[PDB]
Structures are given as C-alpha cells and as structure tokens.
C-alpha cells in the first residue's frame, strides 16, 4: 500500500530538522510562513546551481540560511556581488537581517535531490526513461552508495495509459530506522503531462543513535 | 426483505426506478422469502459522461438469514441489461450456496 | 482457543466471612463494577436468611449450592447434519458457575421489592427444594437422562 516518508519517520532518530529555532506560540505561524516564503524564493533563484539543502536558523533577532550547493561559484558570484544581493533579498523577506553560508558538495551523485533533478532534466529533454534511470543508478553505485532505487511514473513515452517503472540495486532497508536513507521527489513537465521521479539512496547504518548525530 | 437501492451522479435515480427495481427483484427472488432479509443494489457509470460497450456497472448484495452476506457484480451497456445480468448471477450464486449448505 | 492453556484468576475472600465462594457470588451479582452495592445486596440477603433459621450463613449457602449444582449435561455435536445432543459430565468449576448463575437469575426474576429480599427468598426456596434453579437442574437431568443412550 502506501508508505511513510523516509525522512518523516526519522526526525528524532538519525536525522535533524531542516529548521532550528524557537518561537513563542504567537510568532510561530509568522516564522513558519516566512520560512516557507524564503524557501520558495531560493528554489526559484538557484534553480541552475544544483542546490541540495537549505537550513534556516534564527539565533537571536537575526537569520542564518545555509545553502548546500554543488556549484558554489554561481551562488557566490565571480566578485562576490551575488551574495550581497542574496542577503539583501533575505533581509527584505525576513524582518531581521539574514546571513548566508555555503556548503560545497563534493560528491553530488550521493545526493538524492541532485539525482532526481538530473533525471528530470533528461526526461523533459526526451531521453529514454530507462536509459536515464540506469545511468543514474550506475553513477550512484560507482560513487559508493550501498544501494540506490529509482521510480518513474506517468505517461512514459507519451503512452495513453500511464504506468510506473522502477529499478533497484544494492540495499534499501526502509523498515530500519537506524539506516541512512536519502529520499527525493521531482516533477518533469512534458508536452503530454507530468512525470514523477522518486529517488532513494542508502549510505549504510548509523551507529550510536541521535547522540552520535550530536543533537 | 427490505430493499435499499442507490445510484451515482452519472446514473440518475428516481422513485419510479425504486418502485420498478423493488417489484422486479421481489418477483424474481420471492421463493426464498424468510431466508433473506436485506437487498442493496448499487449503480454506477465508470467513465461517466462517455460511452462504451459496457459503460455501466450494477451490483447487488444480499443478506441471507443465517449465512454471511453475499455480493454480485455485472457490467453492461444499459441499466436494464446490468440489472438482468446481476439478477441472473445472484440467482445462480444463491442456488449454489443453498445446495452446498443443504 | 486453538493453543495455550489460560490460567484461572484468583478471587480474594470476602471481608465478613473470608469465603472465596461468597466473593465469587458477589462477582456474579455485581453490575457495572459496583462491587460495594454487590456486597450490600449479598450481605443483606444473608442476614435475611439467617433471621429465618439460626445457622451458619456460609454453611447454609454452601449446602444450598450443593443442592442446586448440576450433575450431567449434553453438548451439541454436529455430525451427519443433526443435533446429536450427547450427555457428558462437567467439571466442578462449571458446576459451581452454572449453579450460581441459575440462583442469581431466578432471584432476578422473582417478584419482591429488593434484590436482597428476592435473593434470600431464592436461597430459602432452593433449600426447600422448589425453585427456578431447582427446575433448571431438574430439566437438565431430564434431558441428559432422555439422551443417556449415546456415549
């Protein structure tokens, strides 16, 4: 049947939330709405920079956004002017000023989101779906994941009848809560409608629990 | 037996249909009488607002006094055809079950 | 069930008479977990019956229970599409349970003002030998006697 969100099931177990701040019951809604707005803005701005994660933090009367990027050059800017505009936009969005930080990704083919975007790009450009799937699986396994799983569903090839096709290699123990599983979803908009892409990547079992994560 | 017949938005239902369905169903299944206490028929059109050879789904589910409820489905191009197919299938199923249980 | 052997629970003895049998009887009388009212009813009935004749209430209760306990019952066996009520012996626990249930039900169907009064009347009737529980005992003997033929 249906399945729980792989990230959703491990928030307090082996993963951490993507937002870390405290609010009183009254300002919580405002903070959450503005965080969603800034995430929506960043997703559109940095579409071509291969961004993987956004960490929004409110230390005290200020803001701190950490952007995980495979291409730090584009986000940083040739002379660093782009980051100034980014912080200006973030301060405009959030009442207190925001500071940006960059986390360089050196093994992009281990990140589920990046793989899903890569597959979706080819699928929108009309490459064969099970060509892109096998390419992504082989690249991730070469990278070194203990396992990868890819799912593509929709009107594949323009077919009148929609269908779903998946490929898996290695290990993906979803039922093991102590396992590092990265999950991602992406959408491809083709002339014949939408195609959905799901990616699972397994990076071995985490030891020591949340204390090892140092929560 | 009490009769509870329902349709969907596509099919269109009326009290005239209720009376006709009740009369026909009772006439066909009058033999069992006390053996059976409840009928519920349901009508749908699947791909509503389009057409096909079957394009309509009839169901009838009956509760026999004693044994557990038993259900039957049929697909046909018209409401009357769906009803007739479902009636025939119910008759066969009830005959088989009663012969089995003796 | 299809497996396991569930063990029996322990019923603590009653306060006044320290009798597990009387505690079990109170549990039969009890409704909706109102055990305090159950004890009130049972003890009122016991006082009422003690008033009639001067004897130990516990001894009177156990004597009447022995009077009302069953001997033999049939358990329906479905073979060849027929009832085949087959007489059989029953364990002491079942004997006691059916006796208590019959007493309480007969008291409930009696026609006095209060449950204590009608329970006391039922105990007196069972001691005498004419009551609804006595009639159910007689009926079960009669039917298991009619069907003695089968094993």
């Amino acid at each position: 049947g249906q399945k729980v969100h792989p990230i959703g099931i491990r928030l307090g177990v082996v993963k951490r939330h993507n937002a870390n701040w405290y609010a009183n019951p009254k300002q919580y809604a405002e903070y959450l709405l503005k965080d969603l707005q800034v995430r929506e803005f960043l997703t559109k701005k940095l579409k071509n920079a291969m961004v993987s994660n956004i960490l929004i933090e409110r230390p005290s009367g200020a803001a701190k956004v950490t952007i995980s990027t495979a291409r730090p050059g584009i986000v940083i800017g040739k002379k660093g002017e782009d980051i100034e505009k980014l912080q200006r936009e973030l301060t405009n969005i959030m009442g207190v000023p925001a500071q940006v930080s960059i986390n360089e990704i050196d093994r992009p083919d281990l990140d589920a989101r990046l793989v899903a975007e890569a597959i979706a790009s080819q699928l929108e450009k009309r490459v064969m779906f099970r060509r892109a799937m096998k390419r992504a699986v082989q690249n991730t396994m070469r990278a070194g994941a203990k396992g990868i799983k890819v799912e593509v569903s929709g009107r594949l090839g323009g077919a009148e009848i929609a269908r779903t096709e998946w490929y898996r290699e290695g290990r993906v123990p979803l039922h093991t809560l102590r396992a590092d599983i990265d999950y991602a979803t992406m959408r491809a908009e083709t002339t014949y409608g939408t195609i959905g892409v799901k990616v699972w990547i397994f990076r071995g079992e985490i030891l020591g629990g949340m204390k090892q994560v140092m929560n | 037996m009490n009769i509870e017949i329902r349709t969907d938005k596509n099919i269109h239902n009326s009290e005239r249909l209720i009376t006709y369905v009740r009369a026909e169903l009772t006439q066909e299944f009058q033999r069992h009488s006390e053996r059976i206490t409840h009928f519920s028929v349901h009508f749908s059109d699947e791909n509503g607002d389009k057409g096909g050879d079957k394009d309509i789904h009839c169901m009838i589910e009956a509760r026999p006094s004693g044994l557990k409820p038993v259900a039957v489905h049929h697909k046909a191009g018209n409401i009357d055809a769906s009803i007739h197919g479902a009636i025939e299938k119910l008759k066969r199923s009830l005959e088989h079950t009663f012969e089995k249980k003796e | 069930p299809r497996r396991r052997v569930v063990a029996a629970r322990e019923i603590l003895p009653d306060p006044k008479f320290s009798s597990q049998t009387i505690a079990k009887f109170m549990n039969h009388v009890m409704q909706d977990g109102k055990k305090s009212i159950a004890e009130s009813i049972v003890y009122g009935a016991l006082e009422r019956v003690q008033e009639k004749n001067k004897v130990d209430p516990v001894e009177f209760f156990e004597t009447t229970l022995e009077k009302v306990r069953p001997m033999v019952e049939v358990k329906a066996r479905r073979v060849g599409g027929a009832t085949y009520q087959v007489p059989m012996e029953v364990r002491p626990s079942r004997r006691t349970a059916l006796a208590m249930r019959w007493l309480v039900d007969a008291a409930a169907k009696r026609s006095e003002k209060t449950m204590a009064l009608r329970l006391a009347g039922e105990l007196l009737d069972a001691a005498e030998g004419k009551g609804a529980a006595i009639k159910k005992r007689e009926d079960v003997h009669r039917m298991a006697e009619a069907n003695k033929a089968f094993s």
């Binding site: 870390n20 701040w21 405290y22 409110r58 230390p59 005290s60 | - | -």
Partner: protein, 50 residues
Amino acid sequence: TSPHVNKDARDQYEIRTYKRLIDIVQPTDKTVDALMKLDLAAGVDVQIAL
C-alpha cells in the same frame, strides 16, 4: 492524510517544549560580564532576570 474522505486514516504529530531553570547567587562583576559576553546558540531561548 487522505485528500478527500478517510476519517480513520490520520497522522498524529506532537511538539514538546522543554524548560530548564538555573540560579546563580553571590555573583561578581566579572561573572555578570562573562554571562553577557557568552554567545547564544539557536533553538534555545534564554531569559536572564536580575
């Protein structure tokens, strides 16, 4: 969890607020300045009362 109609199919979430209390007594001028100088990490709202 269902878009349209399933009342029995739901997700139950919880959020917890943890509170801790500290007193410091016989404090000195260097202690108070050290406490003010100390940095604050996110996720922990700290209230100081004199």
